[PDB]
Every structure is written in structure tokens, then in C-alpha cells.
């Protein structure tokens, strides 16, 4: 299967109530395994997965330094950006960034990336060529140049192709199994009376992992994509996930419909009915 290591960093300024906050969280296969919150009691990097606690003190010291070091340099960036865009000093702003790599089922690198975002809007990003940059506006153009006339793409590419995939294996070695774990969804439909002789059926699905899942209602072999109404897959709070997809049907004719639950943890899709 495919795997990917990535880092979601956030440096949000906020005048009037403390200094700018810097958070650094990493993900392995879309699962948070590491973190660092400038707001923590003892601001430092900490594991988020049991299989991450193996790494010794030497590892966590290096990462904490990196975060402590970046956190500082990002604070300027917020100031640097204040001038590029010429905004006052009082309105909190925020810079985010996603960077990492994706590894194919064969082990190769599928793609390496890095995307910056000032105030929720795109700012600058490393192209697929891993050598050029793509600015979104004129402010990015400066950074673009600053990085070109500095040799940034080569150093970032070196990390995306070296550090990323290497340590990806490291973590993946003692974390793959636990990541591949699966908890089948505990489904069932619910009945709800509605005005004008109708009736709404809600296809539930609780306690499943991973979060990816698909619930679809059907009538005579037809998926009711538009007549449907589902919710955002929300965390149950116990590692598992919940979700539900309902559809309105006519009373009596209620047993003619069924939602098919598709989930990794299922050898065959379920078929619920009221």
C-alpha cells in the first residue's frame, strides 16, 4: 500500500492577548504521530502514537530544538508579511503550511510538496518539478526570488527525497501495523415520522476505523445521490468514528430502500433496511 509523511505547521499572530502561537504537527498516513504547541505547559515535541514513545530523549530534543528554532523564525515571517502586504499591527494574521511526501505502494516517491498559506489563502508552493516555485501574488514573488537567489528548492528537495522517505520507513516500521488496524462499523437504520405521509430513514454507522467510509441509500438498484442527506464523519472520541446518511421515503413503502455501507473493515458491503 501507499504511505506518506507530512507536516502541518501554524504560526498565528495575535496582538492584544499574548505572543504569536506556533504549532507543529506531523502526520503519517494521515495519522497524527507527533506534535508541538508553543502554548503547552512545557513547550516541546511530544509523541501522539504509542509506537512513537520508543524513540529516545535524543530524538525529542532534536525536534524540540527545530520547533523552538522555527517558531522564532516564523514570528519574523509574520512581521515580514506585515510589510509585503502592509497591514497594521493589531489585526491577528496567520501563516500555515503543509509540506511532506507521498510514497507509492512500491516504495518509490510519488510526490513531494510544500504549500504556504497566509490568512487562509494560498501564498507560495514548491512545484512538482521540485526545483521551481509558484507564487500566488506579488508578495509571494519576493519570497520566490529570495528562495531562488538562495538555493532553497535544492535543500527542500533534498529533505523531501531524503529525510522524508527515510524516516517515513522508520516510523512506518513500528507504526504500520497499528495504522492498518480496522474496526467494522456498527450500523442500523432509524425511523422518523414526517409531515405529508413521508418518512425519513437514517442510516447510522458508529465505532469504525479508519474514518474513510461510504454510505449510500438505493432504490431498485439506484444510488440516491441527490435525494440523500449525510453528515461529516465525526470522531466518537475513542479512536473510532461515526457518521450517518438518511433519505426521505413514503410511508409503508419504507422497506423498498436500503443503504449500503462500504468500509475497509468489511469483507463485503453491508445492506441495511428498516
Amino acid at each position: 500500500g501507499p504511505h506518506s509523511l507530512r507536516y502541518f505547521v501554524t504560526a498565528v499572530s495575535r496582538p492584544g492577548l499574548g505572543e504569536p502561537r506556533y504549532m507543529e504537527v506531523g502526520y503519517v498516513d494521515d495519522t497524527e504521530f507527533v506534535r508541538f504547541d508553543s502554548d503547552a505547559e512545557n513547550p516541546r515535541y511530544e509523541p501522539r502514537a504509542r509506537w512513537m514513545e520508543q524513540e529516545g530523549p535524543e530524538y525529542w530534543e532534536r525536534e524540540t530544538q527545530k520547533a523552538k528554532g522555527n517558531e522564532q523564525s516564523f514570528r519574523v515571517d509574520l512581521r515580514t508579511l506585515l510589510g509585503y502586504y502592509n497591514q497594521s499591527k493589531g489585526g491577528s494574521h496567520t501563516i500555515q503550511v503543509i509540506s511532506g511526501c507521498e510514497v507509492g505502494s512500491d516504495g518509490r516517491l510519488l510526490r513531494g510538496y510544500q504549500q504556504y498559506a497566509y490568512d487562509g489563502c494560498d501564498y507560495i508552493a514548491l512545484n512538482e518539478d521540485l526545483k521551481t516555485w509558484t507564487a500566488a501574488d506579488m508578495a509571494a514573488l519576493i519570497t520566490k526570488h529570495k528562495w531562488e537567489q538562495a538555493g532553497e528548492a535544492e535543500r527542500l528537495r533534498a529533505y523531501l527525497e531524503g529525510t522524508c522517505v527515510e524516516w517515513l520507513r522508520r516510523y512506518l516500521k513500528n507504526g504500520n501495523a497499528t495504522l492498518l488496524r480496522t474496526d467494522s462499523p456498527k450500523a442500523h437504520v432509524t425511523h422518523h415520522s414526517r409531515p405529508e405521509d413521508k418518512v425519513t430513514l437514517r442510516c447510522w454507522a458508529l465505532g469504525f476505523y479508519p474514518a474513510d467510509i461510504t454510505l449510500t441509500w438505493q432504490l431498485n438498484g439506484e444510488e440516491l445521490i441527490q435525494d440523500m442527506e449525510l453528515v461529516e464523519t465525526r470522531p466518537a472520541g475513542d479512536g473510532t468514528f461515526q457518521k450517518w446518511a438518511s433519505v426521505v421515503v413514503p410511508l409503508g413503502k419504507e422497506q423498498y430502500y436500503t443503504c449500503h455501507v462500504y468500509h475497509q473493515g468489511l469483507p463485503e458491503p453491508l445492506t441495511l433496511r428498516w
Binding site: 507536516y7 505547521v9 507543529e24 506531523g26 507527533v34 515535541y45 532534536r62 525536534e63 527545530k66 520547533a67 528554532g69 522555527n70 523564525s73 516564523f74 519574523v76 515571517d77 515580514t80 508579511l81 509585503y84 501563516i95 503550511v97 509540506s99 504556504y116 501564498y123 507560495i124 519570497t143 529570495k146 528562495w147 538562495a150 532553497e152 535543500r155 527542500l156 529533505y159 529525510t163 524516516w167
Partner: peptide, 8 residues
């Protein structure tokens, strides 16, 4: 692992 970011 953790990357060392560059200034804007």
C-alpha cells in the same frame, strides 16, 4: 522528520 523552515 521535522523540517527547518526558511524565512519569507
Amino acid at each position: 522528520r521535522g523540517y527547518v523552515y526558511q524565512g519569507l
